[PDB]
């Protein structure tokens, strides 16, 4: 049947959660129970744009949805989510989150996030496995897939002490890894108490929020995590060349959450063993300068080589690179065709090379205040004069 006229309906809906609509895409992988109302097959990625779309595909009591609520409180982001079914032992659970090609021919687990593009036109720039990246096997599958998919995987340590976070961060010297160790303590409405949360999804919602307002070259390293009430351990940002808990974990290349009932993500070093790739600003800018360069020069794979093919790409590359210097992503790029490697034997194979040097904007990691108390202006005032 239908209805004509206006209905009113008493229905409880919980206090809307406005966020900036972001363009970044996030690859998510966690556990859920495939039931009746959960309209998702387990090892099949689904595109998510809403908390309703997360609770219609997955259960509202699932661990997918708690990770998706963790992102939608900060950014209205696009989430390619893969609902790995639960398992008994943590050896078989970590094996199911990693997954693989162990189907007939399908891709399961984290490996289904490589299917995010060509299923939904959403190639995941952020990889998150909440609660499962604490195992060293999953966090290596996060690593090798962030290298393929050209993304930043957001890890997390255990619930344990600082030294269990430092010793777990020495297992990785990879550029694409970004560990956030202290878990989030979020207030649960059902139990009416503070539930723990693995804080990887809260980083990824803020990592994608920074792309909206501040741009992908900005660091997420002082921005505000929303929807949280505290951390699992109190993290201590103090000064004085001390053993501060925020400074201990930053020197192990781990971001923390530092103030005000768990208020701000703090670090900006990635887990790299190379000082050229220390900041995630360096890793994210180089990753998304090219994704704007590539998506924008899709005409260079067709369009058979004429005389001014190599010239029309350089002036096309310089034009989509002065748009990046304009908005502040780079500072004084340099684009030119490679004069030493553009042979005609390379050109018969269809190969033609270019050089796209640029300089990234540095983050203001350590402002230094040299404060002094003087008695210089003790006579300039406080006198008859």
């Amino acid at each position: 049947s239908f209805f004509h006229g206006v209905t009113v309906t008493n229905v409880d809906i919980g206090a809307r959660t406005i966020a900036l609509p972001a363009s970044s895409v996030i690859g998510l992988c966690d556990v859920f129970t495939p039931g009746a109302q959960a309209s998702a097959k387990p090892n099949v990625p689904v595109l998510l744009t809403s908390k309703k779309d997360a609770a219609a595909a997955f259960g509202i009591g699932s661990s997918i949805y708690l990770a998706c609520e963790a992102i939608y409180n900060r950014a209205q982001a696009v989430i390619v989510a893969v609902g790995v079914e639960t398992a008994e032992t943590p050896e078989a659970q970590a094996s199911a989150v990693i997954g693989g090609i162990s189907a007939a021919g399908e891709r399961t687990g984290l490996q289904a996030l490589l299917d995010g593009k060509s299923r939904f036109n959403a190639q995941p720039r952020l990889l998150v496995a909440p609660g499962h990246s604490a195992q060293q096997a999953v966090a290596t599958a996060m690593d090798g897939l962030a290298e393929k998919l050209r993304a930043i995987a957001i890890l997390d340590g255990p619930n344990s002490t600082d030294e269990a976070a430092v010793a777990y961060a020495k297992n990785f010297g990879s550029k694409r890894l970004f560990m956030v160790d202290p878990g989030v303590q979020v207030w649960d409405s059902a139990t009416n108490a503070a539930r723990n949360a693995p804080a990887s999804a809260y980083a990824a919602g803020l990592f994608a929020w920074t792309d909206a307002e501040y741009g992908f070259w900005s660091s997420p390293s002082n921005k505000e995590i929303k929807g949280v009430t505290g951390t699992s351990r109190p993290v201590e940002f103090l000064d004085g060349d001390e053993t501060c808990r925020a400074n201990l974990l930053n020197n192990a290349n781990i971001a923390t959450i530092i103030r005000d009932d768990g208020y701000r993500l703090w670090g900006n070093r990635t887990l790299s063993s190379d000082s050229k790739w220390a900041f995630v600003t360096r890793v994210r800018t180089m990753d998304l300068v090219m994704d704007a360069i590539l998506a924008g020069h899709k005409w260079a794979v067709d369009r058979g080589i004429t005389k001014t093919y190599v010239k029309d790409v350089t002036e096309g590359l310089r034009a989509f690179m002065r748009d990046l210097k304009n908005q502040g992503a780079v500072i004084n790029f340099e684009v030119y065709a490679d004069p030493d490697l553009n042979s005609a034997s390379q050109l018969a194979q269809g190969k033609v090379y270019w050089n796209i040097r640029f300089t990234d904007v540095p983050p203001a990691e350590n402002p230094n205040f040299r404060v002094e108390v003087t008695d210089q202006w003790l006579t300039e005032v406080l006198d008859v004069a």
Binding site: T306, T308, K311, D312, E315, G316, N326
Partner: protein, 167 residues
């Protein structure tokens, strides 16, 4: 010097060559915006610079040529790219290329009078938002108004105002 003169022109709009139907090109007239400056203790003005004028490059085709008609009036200004090329000959036979890559808004399409026996000429005009002139493969001009750049021999003349404005 050697007596040198243009003999041939060409046009590339979006990589497509107009090597059959562009009878006339016009590079943008680079004029600086002078103000005649007469002040104390002097009998004549002195013409301080105030920046560049607005650049328009115009060109004509006289076939149909959808490959230039489809760039009029897009929402994306500075999306008309385009390369004006010229070959300057010289008496001794050393042809010098003059290539002017430019970018902007195709701002007017002027199909003229259509008489029957007379050649009909579509006159176009672009509103230049980027302009680089290379002569003999060497950068002479490079003008980008937004991201204020005025390079004259590869030397950016606006590095003075760039640090003053904090750009």
């Amino acid at each position: 010097m050697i007596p040198q003169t243009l003999t041939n022109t060409n046009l590339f709009i979006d990589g497509v060559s107009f090597a059959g139907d562009v009878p006339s090109l016009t590079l943008p007239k680079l004029a600086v915006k002078t103000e005649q400056y007469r002040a104390g203790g002097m009998d004549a003005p002195v013409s301080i610079d105030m920046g560049l004028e607005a650049m328009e490059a115009k060109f004509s085709t006289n076939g149909a040529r959808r490959e230039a008609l489809n760039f009029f009036g897009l929402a994306d200004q500075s999306a008309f790219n385009g390369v004006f090329r010229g070959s300057f000959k010289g008496q001794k036979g050393a042809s010098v290329p003059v290539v002017a890559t430019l970018r902007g808004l195709l701002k007017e399409v002027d199909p003229g009078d259509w008489k029957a026996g007379e050649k009909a000429e579509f006159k176009y005009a672009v509103a230049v938002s980027y302009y680089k002139l290379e002569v003999d493969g060497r950068e002479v001009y490079e003008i980008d108004p937004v991201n204020g750049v005025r390079a004259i021999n590869g030397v950016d003349q606006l590095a003075g105002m760039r640090n003053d404005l904090g750009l």
